[PDB]
Amino acid sequence: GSSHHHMPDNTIQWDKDADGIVTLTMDDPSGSTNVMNEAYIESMGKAVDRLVAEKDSITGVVVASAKKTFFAGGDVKTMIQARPEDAGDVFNTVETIKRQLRTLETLGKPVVAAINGAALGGGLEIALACHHRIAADVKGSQLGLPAVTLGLLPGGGGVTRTVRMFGIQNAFVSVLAQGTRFKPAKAKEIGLVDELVATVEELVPAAKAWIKEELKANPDGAGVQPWDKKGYKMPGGTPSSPGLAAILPSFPSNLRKQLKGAPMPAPRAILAAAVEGAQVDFDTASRIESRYFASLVTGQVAKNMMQAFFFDLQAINAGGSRPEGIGKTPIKRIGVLGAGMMGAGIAYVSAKAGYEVVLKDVSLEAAAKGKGYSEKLEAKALERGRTTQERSDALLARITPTADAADFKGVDFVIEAVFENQELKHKVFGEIEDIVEPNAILGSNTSTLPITGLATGVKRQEDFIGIHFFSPVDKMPLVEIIKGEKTSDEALARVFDYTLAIGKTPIVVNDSRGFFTSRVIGTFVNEALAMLGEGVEPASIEQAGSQAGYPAPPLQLSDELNLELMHKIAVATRKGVEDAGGTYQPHPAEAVVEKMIELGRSGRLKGAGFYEYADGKRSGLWPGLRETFKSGSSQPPLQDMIDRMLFAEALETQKCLDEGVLTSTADANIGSIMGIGFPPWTGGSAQFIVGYSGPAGTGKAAFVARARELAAAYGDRFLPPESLLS
Amino acid sequence: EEAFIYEAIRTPRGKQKNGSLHEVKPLSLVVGLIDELRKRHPDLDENLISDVILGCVSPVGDQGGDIARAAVLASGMPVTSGGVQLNRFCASGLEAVNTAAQKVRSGWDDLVLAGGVESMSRVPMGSDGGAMGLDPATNYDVMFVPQSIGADLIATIEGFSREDVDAYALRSQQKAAEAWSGGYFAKSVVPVRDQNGLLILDHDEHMRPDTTKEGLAKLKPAFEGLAALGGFDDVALQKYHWVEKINHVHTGGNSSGIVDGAALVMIGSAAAGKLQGLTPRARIVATATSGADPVIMLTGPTPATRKVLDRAGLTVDDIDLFELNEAFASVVLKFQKDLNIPDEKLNVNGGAIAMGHPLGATGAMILGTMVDELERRNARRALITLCIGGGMGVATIIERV
Amino acid sequence: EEAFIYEAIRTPRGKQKNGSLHEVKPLSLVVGLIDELRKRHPDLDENLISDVILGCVSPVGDQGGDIARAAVLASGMPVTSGGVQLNRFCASGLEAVNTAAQKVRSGWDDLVLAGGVESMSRVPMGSDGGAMGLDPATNYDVMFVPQSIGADLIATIEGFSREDVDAYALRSQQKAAEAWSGGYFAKSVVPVRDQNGLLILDHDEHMRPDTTKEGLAKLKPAFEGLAALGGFDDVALQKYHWVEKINHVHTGGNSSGIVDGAALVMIGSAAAGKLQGLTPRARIVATATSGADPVIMLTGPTPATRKVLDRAGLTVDDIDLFELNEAFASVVLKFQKDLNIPDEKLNVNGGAIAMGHPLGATGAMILGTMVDELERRNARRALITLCIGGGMGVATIIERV
Numbered sequence A: 001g002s003s004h005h006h007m008p009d010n011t012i013q014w015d016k017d018a019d020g021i022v023t024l025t026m027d028d029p030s031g032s033t034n035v036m037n038e039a040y041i042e043s044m045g046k047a048v049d050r051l052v053a054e055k056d057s058i059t060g061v062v063v064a065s066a067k068k069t070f071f072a073g074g075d076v077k078t079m080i081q082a083r084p085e086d087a088g089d090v091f092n093t094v095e096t097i098k099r100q101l102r103t104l105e106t107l108g109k110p111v112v113a114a115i116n117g118a119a120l121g122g123g124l125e126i127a128l129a130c131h132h133r134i135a136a137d138v139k140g141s142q143l144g145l146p147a148v149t150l151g152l153l154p155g156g157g158g159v160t161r162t163v164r165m166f167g168i169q170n171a172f173v174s175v176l177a178q179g180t181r182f183k184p185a186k187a188k189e190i191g192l193v194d195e196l197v198a199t200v201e202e203l204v205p206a207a208k209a210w211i212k213e214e215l216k217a218n219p220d221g222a223g224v225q226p227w228d229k230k231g232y233k234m235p236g237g238t239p240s241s242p243g244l245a246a247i248l249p250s251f252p253s254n255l256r257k258q259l260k261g262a263p264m265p266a267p268r269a270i271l272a273a274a275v276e277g278a279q280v281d282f283d284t285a286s287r288i289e290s291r292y293f294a295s296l297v298t299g300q301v302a303k304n305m306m307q308a309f310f311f312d313l314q315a316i317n318a319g320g321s322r323p324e325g326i327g328k329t330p331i332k333r334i335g336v337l338g339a340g341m342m343g344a345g346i347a348y349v350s351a352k353a354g355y356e357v358v359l360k361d362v363s364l365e366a367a368a369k370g371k372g373y374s375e376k377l378e379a380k381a382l383e384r385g386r387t388t389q390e391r392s393d394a395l396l397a398r399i400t401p402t403a404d405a406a407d408f409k410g411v412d413f414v415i416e417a418v419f420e421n422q423e424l425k426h427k428v429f430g431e432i433e434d435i436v437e438p439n440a441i442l443g444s445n446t447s448t449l450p451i452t453g454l455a456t457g458v459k460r461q462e463d464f465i466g467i468h469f470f471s472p473v474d475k476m477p478l479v480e481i482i483k484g485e486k487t488s489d490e491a492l493a494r495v496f497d498y499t500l501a502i503g504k505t506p507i508v509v510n511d512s513r514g515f516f517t518s519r520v521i522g523t524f525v526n527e528a529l530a531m532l533g534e535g536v537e538p539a540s541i542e543q544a545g546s547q548a549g550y551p552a553p554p555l556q557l558s559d560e561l562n563l564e565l566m567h568k569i570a571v572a573t574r575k576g577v578e579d580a581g582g583t584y585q586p587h588p589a590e591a592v593v594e595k596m597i598e599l600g601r602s603g604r605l606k607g608a609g610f611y612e613y614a615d616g617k618r619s620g621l622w623p624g625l626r627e628t629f630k631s632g633s634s635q636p637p638l639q640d641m642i643d644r645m646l647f648a649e650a651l652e653t654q655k656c657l658d659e660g661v662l663t664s665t666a667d668a669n670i671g672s673i674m675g676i677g678f679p680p681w682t683g684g685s686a687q688f689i690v691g692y693s694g695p696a697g698t699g700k701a702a703f704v705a706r707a708r709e710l711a712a713a714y715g716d717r718f719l720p721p722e723s724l725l726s
Numbered sequence B, C: 001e002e003a004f005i006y007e008a009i010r011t012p013r014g015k016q017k018n019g020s021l022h023e024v025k026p027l028s029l030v031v032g033l034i035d036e037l038r039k040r041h042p043d044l045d046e047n048l049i050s051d052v053i054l055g056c057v058s059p060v061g062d063q064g065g066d067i068a069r070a071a072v073l074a075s076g077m078p079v080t081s082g083g084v085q086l087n088r089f090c091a092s093g094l095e096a097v098n099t100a101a102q103k104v105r106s107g108w109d110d111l112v113l114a115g116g117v118e119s120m121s122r123v124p125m126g127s128d129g130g131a132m133g134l135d136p137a138t139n140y141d142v143m144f145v146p147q148s149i150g151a152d153l154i155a156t157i158e159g160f161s162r163e164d165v166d167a168y169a170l171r172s173q174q175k176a177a178e179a180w181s182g183g184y185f186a187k188s189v190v191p192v193r194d195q196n197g198l199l200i201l202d203h204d205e206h207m208r209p210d211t212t213k214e215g216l217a218k219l220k221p222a223f224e225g226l227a228a229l230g231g232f233d234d235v236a237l238q239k240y241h242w243v244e245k246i247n248h249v250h251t252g253g254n255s256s257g258i259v260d261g262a263a264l265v266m267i268g269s270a271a272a273g274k275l276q277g278l279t280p281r282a283r284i285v286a287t288a289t290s291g292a293d294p295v296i297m298l299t300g301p302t303p304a305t306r307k308v309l310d311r312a313g314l315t316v317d318d319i320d321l322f323e324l325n326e327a328f329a330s331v332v333l334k335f336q337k338d339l340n341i342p343d344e345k346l347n348v349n350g351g352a353i354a355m356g357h358p359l360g361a362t363g364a365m366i367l368g369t370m371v372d373e374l375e376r377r378n379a380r381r382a383l384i385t386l387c388i389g390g391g392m393g394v395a396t397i398i399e400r401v
């Protein structure tokens, strides 16, 4: 019963010329991109049946696309709805897809992929089933298998074929483990595509020219993959070779080294499927690959990551949090205030997006060092990673550093990133309000100070907005847009367009204490400091942070985020709630931050914090921590430490959803991932509640059950809010 | 019913690089020991020998195909003598003796020949592969780290410094040299010879009797490049989260040597000895198998020792000699700190740090070492234990008779 | 003291060419069986499990590195459960059970997990090498011939014709089909599934239930080119000088199949069962190890059977069921002619000719087959024996309780 099929519409156009070459042109009618949906599986199933039925009159096949891209996507809506009881349907579906490619791969005739645009995921897997791949050397077209970013693996033969092409080590580290995307010139160097052409018009003609040339110069080996020949030698050997087996035990350990012990199952499954596939024949390896793919699609982690990195990110880029009805207003010249580490990058990401920006600071020497931050990032791109070109000179020609305030004549977009002092920002904005153009926008890179009070320094308060960047803005992709009480919708509409133009993803929040990103980080770092004061080993706290999924351990972050500045937030929030008539209940972590400051250890700036610092490098933990906080006298389970730092952020983001700081759960998930470092496997701090998986169960029911258990043993701050049906 | 030891001999241990035993196939090492047992009792009816149990950790190539059965047939032994290879890692030698004692104790076997053989210069470590190391899903889940990483972690947790482990390595070289100097090994070490009777090796050539405390301190940590490239340091610290950094203290001088060798023990019942005119040398009192965390791996000896003491009904005070294999110095120091064992009881004749560690044969070698010291000192009880891969533990209590 | 069998399960046997179990690593076969034993007794305190003994004939690659220990750690079993691989060729499965019963009988172990595993489609025969085959001096002296040459020599000496061995091969296919048809294997054959719970194999796919007597006669002697090119025919006739010519009667239809599979048996003492709420299924009465000429190799079952009968004090009349592994048809016919065993007692549910022969696991498989037929027929005693390479023999007598 197993065949090439699993009333749709046809997505493949058939054409056979007089030479016998069949040109399969992928052209999905429903949509502008070729997507691996139910229509494609039926279309390709019909196409490969006709190739077998007409094999006498056919001499070669050319797989091309009628879209601007080649092939990229898949019905994510079906994959996220796959329950563990549907593992059989998932397996048979992916087995059918690979069966179609395996038939196309073994027709005894050369098949050529004509890659005109992006070939991602299932698209590259189709091209990898071919014998010769020609790519059009046009920028914007990618080639990769980014299934790991959705908690999945390349189930359509990606793992099996990349390993047969490159070997276990290179295929995993370079192609599979990270879903790396390659440019057509880059993909030619490693071996994904075999040759390049300048224009897409000469793509298919060159594909047919290679077929005639292949049949004439190599008739016996035409249409045969290297792994289908007798005496095939896998690059780097098989797991039984003494060379590869000598280092094979280090492949999983180095994977745990990179993942830091985080419960992300997809990288482990890819490595397992790759090595187990290399021990058996190609057809058996494909089946092993299918069983690991079904293991991930039915898992909860892949549903979290598909929810965040596909659905939530697509809804944000669709202008979900942007106010509808407002058109598009342009940006003539951007003005950055403060050439510090944050401010220097804003001038870079703005200039990298083609915006001509003027970077102003106090002294000219400070402004030049800010532009030097962009040049340091360009030395690693122009003549290192080969990512830049002679265009980066125009990037740096956009940044015009200065110290005179009169150089802001004609600036339409003003972003400021100065020290966190409201009296200072009230003065620098009053000296620029009348200088820049009237309808200009007054952005403020602020992480704590409320925008409503900060906007009073200017007359046109409706154009004042909070534009919160994260460091370094050259790499961090989240921009937190904070609405003031008087902020107009047309103001944040222009900001929403800007953040999408500089290649970032925006979230819109309302003005409140700690906004959303700063407020939830505080609960994360304060949860670790509370544990240290309780007597928890600081090494366990750092392990609990990295094994939870965070990029940086919490104590290491408590030194980057200066420990003195955390104390100033503590005294500021107390005065705010006390001036409102309420009573302030201190957090347990504040007694810890007061002891570290009293001991003269404030973080990396002073050169001493929780870690020791020598020659600008972070050394080990300070040996005096164990005796200072009685560390070791409290040994809770490591999972309790992991859950404490994850639940505290999850509960706090729920409060932000109740208080109205966030408008959509998509901004909560994406805002926590790209601005807080919340573990990507959770799919966001809001998805963490609905997709929680622990000993108590799965879902919101087990979350509030585990929250009450954490609250019954570690304090009533872990009790779930009322918004969670109890 | 009761299991007794009648003979316990071994070969000298030839070192790895430019070793004398490199030209000797491991099958020859075992038959040479069988020949020696036949020279001591030429009137022994070998048809009563029920089985021949040989431990071997890398049973491939020269050591594949049930080398125990190959020895039975190559040595001209009766065909009814059986033969079976087992692998419980570096406790394979003692597991063979324990299984032999348990086979004798069951009554369904009368006279068993236990031992082990390893030719690490010919069959390197890990030649047999394995899922724990080579299968990613198995490796990633059990958090596999090499035994040397667990050794440095032991010294880090227990506070054993570089000087502390080098002080034991010096002590092992000294007591092994004193043991060879006093002729303690004269009767139990059978020199290896070729088919012409010419000498090949007559002593443990891995020993460095002229080692100084300052000479050990000049050695480099040999496992610093294994942990940095393999990432095994980070894996070990995910399980042991409270430990901040690994202190790499083990080197070539304070770790067991890679050597070739073979050992052989004859275990039988009390009835089998009287029928053959054999005098019993010791009695197997109790055996025990236990284990501990496979990441640290080398802490198995502690619970295995406590279990064999409870089964025999004895405490640490009742045991006169403690023999723990010196795979790494920190393992011995840790096993001593746990059970509070005096130094004068622990590895009195040196160990694997000085004389080498032939994996499959080590358990039987250090057992035969204790049956001699029990007879020499005229002591009563001894306890033999070895650290095992995967976190296992095997302990045996013998009593001189 | 007394050793009892509490559970005895096995996987279906997947064939060599285009087999269903080829995609399953042999470590997965064992943990799947451990999972099944855990589903039957979820309240069993697995810390009382003293050891896990797995027989394996080619412990290399996927089966190296003490796969028994890999199963203990991959299955989430307690770390104190030990784990050890043994190799006594195709009797490794039964040797593990006998060793487990002897370990239980010694009193130093309470609850042991014995069994075996072999993935011949992944780890071919002779992958581990061996001195008997690859070392010329050892090969030339012991006069090594393959087991198939000894099988044809058995039929030549005993007068078993081609029709005689094909008549038994037909009988094995029939009784194995009747056993599967009647559901005799429904409770002891645990179907293999993937990590998603999807079925991989649920039956012995090597069986050919539609085999005819005329279809077997059309097969060619598969070992005619091995004896002519290798010269093993002349070597066998130098030892057996009175035989003039070898009659090559064994083919693909009347020889054991190359299959993948794994088995697992839980053996414990009487005290261990009552403390765990386990009901004993059978009792290990006696075990025995013997052997015969290694050139003919496959005649070991005869003296091993006589020895285990004398130890238990019973004769052939006392045994209700005889289970001998069908490595070759002539071995079964020879073992029957020696002890004068009725056909109705010998391999009542078919054997390896129909269902396959996973080397390391076969001994435990055919043992679990007999603990079921003893319970089904409500019979008392059964005797299990296997022919071993190198001329060895292993026999076990179990009694239903």
Ligand SMILES: CC(C)(COP(=O)(O)OP(=O)(O)OC[C@H]1O[C@@H](n2cnc3c(N)ncnc32)[C@H](O)[C@@H]1OP(=O)(O)O)[C@@H](O)C(=O)NCCC(=O)NCCS
Pocket: B090, B125, B147, B208, B211, B212, B215, B216, B219, B222, B251, B252, B253, B254, B255, B256, B257, B258, B327, B357, B359, B389
């Ligand atoms: C001990 C171990 C470091 C061997 O290292 P090695 O480099 O092969 O051995 P070497 O003897 O050459 O030691 C390296 C150096 O140390 C020196 N050295 C070793 N022991 C010494 C001693 N006691 N005094 C002085 N120098 C010594 C050597 O002379 C050598 O210097 P060189 O390279 O200039 O000759 C290690 O690899 C080992 O064998 N581990 C044991 C493995 C094990 O236990 N396996 C069981 C699990 S399956």
Ligand SMILES: CC(C)(COP(=O)(O)OP(=O)(O)OC[C@H]1O[C@@H](n2cnc3c(N)ncnc32)[C@H](O)[C@@H]1OP(=O)(O)O)[C@@H](O)C(=O)NCCC(=O)NCCS
Pocket: C090, C125, C147, C208, C211, C212, C215, C216, C219, C222, C251, C252, C253, C254, C255, C256, C257, C258, C327, C357, C359, C389
């Ligand atoms: C049995 C043995 C001959 C296997 O041979 P094989 O060629 O691999 O197996 P096959 O099943 O393909 O048998 C060959 C032919 O016989 C046929 N055949 C086998 N059994 C048959 C049966 N019962 N009825 C009809 N035809 C049968 C097959 O269909 C095949 O014909 P084909 O080649 O056209 O398909 C032999 O190699 C073997 O496995 N020996 C056992 C080894 C052993 O016991 N080892 C232990 C010591 S370590």
